[PDB]
Write a protein that binds this ligand. Structure first.
Ligand SMILES: *[C@@H]1O[C@H](CO)[C@@H](O)[C@H](O)[C@H]1NC(C)=O
Ligand SMILES: *[C@@H]1O[C@H](CO)[C@@H](O)[C@H](O)[C@H]1NC(C)=O
Ligand SMILES: *[C@@H]1O[C@H](CO)[C@@H](O)[C@H](O)[C@H]1NC(C)=O
Ligand SMILES: *[C@@H]1O[C@H](CO)[C@@H](O)[C@H](O)[C@H]1NC(C)=O
Ligand SMILES: *[C@@H]1O[C@H](CO)[C@@H](O)[C@H](O)[C@H]1NC(C)=O
Lengths: 196, 594
């Protein structure tokens, strides 16, 4: 059925790290070798699955999470990692069985005036849980005094923009991460690998 | 939420947004410096105004949290660098007056040139002309005319401006909960909060004075040597009892003695090691210098340089079009962009400056993981010390033979070692009495022990006590000779250079003994030595996070300034001066009377 793996990868517009995307791709012939079309892959971490034995097992669902981060924050997309992306924006579980494919996109998601369309969440009242999303714009409150809504002293907005530019370092350039997560629920699997 | 816990989120948001605004301001300042254009001037001015307004607003927000309740030390240091009122503690009229005083002082120093000789058609500018006629001259009268014409033309304008500048600076320092403006400038070498590693400003004066008293014999022997050699080319204008005129000291202030080498040659039959012909013979252009320099830096153990630094930086001349300022600087623009503006020439001095101005960029790539307000040297003397120890290790004949710019058949000798040691000493230990005297005079002027009606009386008296040079002309009170120095008229701290030398020789002596080197200290190299590279990176990674009394201890073993690595570095020379200075009187005194 030619499972796409192309709307996730060859997308004109990606998503910010706080409002990341998730595509439940199912009922298809997996075609994992289509992914290898892109050459400049900066990371191919493959926890839980052999990187050559993908197209022989069958899973109920696969999830292709898609966001854009810095280059120095791509090490936080891994099981058990902590920081400022693995606990406020995108937390992935300790029982991860997937792929952390993440290439460089400085030539597509960075402008010389600033890509302030790509956001990032700096403040939360609690850490994040595995595969949980928080699209909220409510003000933070560091002080013990009520902010009475929108305010400025000791009442900060949580989201801080990334502001990508072409003249950044490798660790500060935009990185389009496509995380693959295979799910193995005890259900009739709809995704299977090609075999003669 | 405690005050310590609510300060951390404020600091985090400040660090992120200030990193963005600092990148915008620094990129605007680059493209202004590499391209002189009115549009770039307006862009830099707008970015700087936005950054200054942001800094004022965040300082006003940061005054809320007192420092007494905070127990963490990095947050304490960040808020201490963030809670400073600065010049805003004054009234609006007084702040505007101080800003205008600074601006007209800077423009008077920058644009002012002497029109004294003959008709006012002949007016030599300070930057191309006056430095040239001060560096290379053999005339007592011409140097006397140039010296008298500048100080008097500039100082007569400076002095009534300078009294008001001193009064306003002392007022804004007193309102800033400090004691004086000198006490404000000594607030950078201040540690308060750590047990066993603590520093006070009175301790900073005392330690500087003690280190100068320790270093005095070396400078005194060098003084006797340069007086003895300057007697030969200058007859009947210098007395054998002591002292030499201050208008003869290479530069126009006495700051550096580097241009006296042609008249203070240790051995004229043996030329100094120059590689410019050999550097240009092998067609090394402008990229091979900064490729072999990064080869040396990776040989030490320090990491590579990113691809976003070769394309962005400007390492070659800009050409006839695209006017730019050819002053080498190590631009840390912020978020991962490390660029090193520099107009590379085919010269050894350019090679060692490329090693020097990339030491500052390897410090910048090492403390980049630190929070935004801690992204600096632990004091102001760490950066230039790091850069100049890279330059000192790059200047060894062994490293030049290793990288290919020296024939193996060329051999070293004690004569060449003596020549190199005196050449380095004329730059290094020449500037330490000048720095100490100038900063002591400025400290006592700002503190109030020096009366206003007796100010320049002090310089030429203090100068007859510390440096030891005669006044070329009797100068009366109506002047501000101290000023006429880029670092005084533009309100800069000057003790950074003293601290830099006293730390650079400690760093070299402490690193080249971890590299397993046997022999003289002036031939040490960090190349092919990861054991010293990791030791240096142990300090480079800290930044301003840990106090300087500990970061100095993490590489040397001492928690204070020490001139013993300086006197042992410059030991092979010292002895030679002790042997040669036996048929001439040594020291100086105020027995001179005109
Ligand atoms: C990816 O999208 C671009 C959009 O211009 C297109 O040119 C290219 O052919 C696409 N690649 C594949 C493999 O379809
Ligand atoms: C430098 O400034 C000139 C001035 O017109 C303009 O061409 C442009 O802004 C810059 N050009 C280059 C080549 O950097
Ligand atoms: C201050 O807080 C930081 C939190 O990032 C912590 O790492 C550091 O250890 C604290 N300081 C001390 C002295 O414990
Ligand atoms: C990175 O350093 C290594 C030395 O370990 C060497 O390949 C070179 O200096 C650098 N790499 C590139 C591609 O320049
Ligand atoms: C450092 O090691 C390199 C690699 O063998 C060598 O070519 C070079 O001469 C060495 N330099 C020194 C100063 O030992």
């Amino acid at each position: 059925n030619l499972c796409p793996f192309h709307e996730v990868f060859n997308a004109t517009t990606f998503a910010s790290v706080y409002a990341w995307n998730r595509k439940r791709i199912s009922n298809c012939v997996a075609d994992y070798s289509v992914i290898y079309n892109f050459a400049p892959f900066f990371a191919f971490k493959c926890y839980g699955v052999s990187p050559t034995k993908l197209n022989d097992l069958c899973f109920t669902n696969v999830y292709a999470d898609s966001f854009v981060i810095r280059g120095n924050e791509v090490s936080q997309i891994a099981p058990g990692q902590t920081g400022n992306i693995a606990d406020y924006n995108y937390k992935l579980p300790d029982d991860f069985t997937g792929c952390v494919i993440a290439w460089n996109s400085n030539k597509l998601d960075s402008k010389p005036s600033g890509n302030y369309n790509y956001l990032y969440r700096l403040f939360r009242k609690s850490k994040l849980k595995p595969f949980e999303r928080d699209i909220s714009t409510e003000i933070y409150q560091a002080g013990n005094k009520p902010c009475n809504g929108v305010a400025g002293p000791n009442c900060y907005s949580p989201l801080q923009s990334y502001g990508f530019r072409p003249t950044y370092g490798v660790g500060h350039q935009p990185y389009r991460v496509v995380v693959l997560s295979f799910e193995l629920l005890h259900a009739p699997a709809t995704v299977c690998g090609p075999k003669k | 939420s405690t005050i310590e816990e609510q300060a951390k989120t404020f600091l985090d948001k400040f660090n992120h947004e200030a990193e963005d605004l600092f990148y915008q301001s620094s990129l605007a300042s680059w493209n202004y410096n590499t391209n002189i254009t009115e549009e770039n001037v307006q862009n830099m001015n707008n970015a700087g105004d936005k950054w200054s307004a942001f800094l004022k607003e965040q300082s006003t927000l940061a005054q809320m949290y007192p420092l007494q309740e905070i127990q963490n030390l990095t947050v304490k240091l960040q808020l201490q660098a963030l809670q400073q009122n600065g010049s805003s503690v004054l009234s609006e009229d007084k702040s505007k007056r101080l800003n205008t005083i600074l601006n007209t002082m800077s423009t008077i120093y920058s644009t002012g040139k002497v029109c004294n000789p003959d008709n006012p058609q002949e007016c030599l500018l300070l930057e191309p002309g006056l430095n040239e006629i001060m560096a290379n001259s053999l005339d007592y009268n011409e140097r006397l005319w140039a010296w008298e014409s500048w100080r008097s033309e500039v100082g007569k304008q400076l002095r009534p401006l300078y009294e008001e500048y001193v009064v306003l600076k002392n007022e804004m320092a007193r309102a800033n909960h400090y004691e004086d403006y000198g006490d404000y400038w000594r607030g950078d070498y201040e540690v308060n909060g750590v047990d066993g590693y603590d520093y006070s400003r009175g301790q900073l004066i005392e330690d500087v004075e003690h280190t100068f008293e320790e270093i005095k014999p070396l400078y005194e022997h060098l003084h006797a040597y340069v007086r003895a050699k300057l007697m030969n080319a200058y007859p009947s204008y210098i007395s054998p009892i002591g002292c030499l005129p201050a208008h003869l000291l290479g530069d126009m202030w006495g700051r550096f003695w580097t241009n006296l080498y042609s008249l203070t040659v240790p051995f004229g039959q043996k030329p100094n090691i120059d590689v410019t012909d050999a550097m240009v013979d092998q067609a090394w252009d402008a990229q091979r210098i900064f490729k072999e320099a990064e080869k040396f830096f990776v040989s030490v153990g320090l990491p590579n340089m990113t691809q976003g630094f070769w394309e962005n930086s400007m390492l070659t001349d800009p050409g006839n079009v695209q006017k730019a300022v050819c002053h080498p600087t190590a631009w840390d623009l912020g978020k991962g962009d490390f660029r090193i503006l520099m107009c590379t020439k085919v010269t050894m001095d350019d090679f060692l400056t490329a090693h020097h101005e990339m030491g500052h960029i390897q410090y910048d790539m090492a403390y980049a993981a630190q929070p935004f307000l801690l992204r600096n040297g632990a004091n102001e003397g760490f950066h230039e010390a790091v850069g100049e120890i890279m330059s000192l290790s790059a200047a060894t004949p062994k490293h030049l033979k290793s990288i290919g710019l020296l024939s193996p058949d060329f051999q070293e000798d004690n004569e060449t070692e003596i020549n190199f040691l005196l050449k380095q000493a004329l730059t290094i230990v020449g500037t330490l009495p000048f720095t100490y005297m100038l900063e002591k005079w400025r400290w006592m002027v700002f503190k109030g022990e020096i009366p206003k009606d007796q100010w320049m009386k002090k310089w030429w008296e203090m100068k007859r006590e510390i440096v030891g040079v005669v006044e070329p002309v009797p100068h009366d009170e109506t002047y501000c000779d101290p000023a006429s120095l880029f670092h005084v008229s533009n309100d800069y701290s000057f003790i950074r250079y003293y601290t830099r030398t006293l730390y650079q020789f400690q760093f070299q002596e402490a690193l080249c003994q971890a590299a397993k080197h046997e022999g003289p200290l002036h031939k040490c190299d960090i190349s092919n030595s990861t054991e010293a590279g990791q030791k240096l990176f142990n300090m480079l990674r800290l930044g301003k996070s840990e106090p300087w009394t500990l970061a100095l201890e993490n590489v040397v073993g001492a928690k204070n300034m020490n001139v013993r690595p300086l006197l042992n570095y410059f030991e092979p020379l010292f002895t030679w001066l002790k042997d040669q200075n036996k048929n001439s009187f040594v020291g100086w005194s105020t027995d001179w009377s005109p």
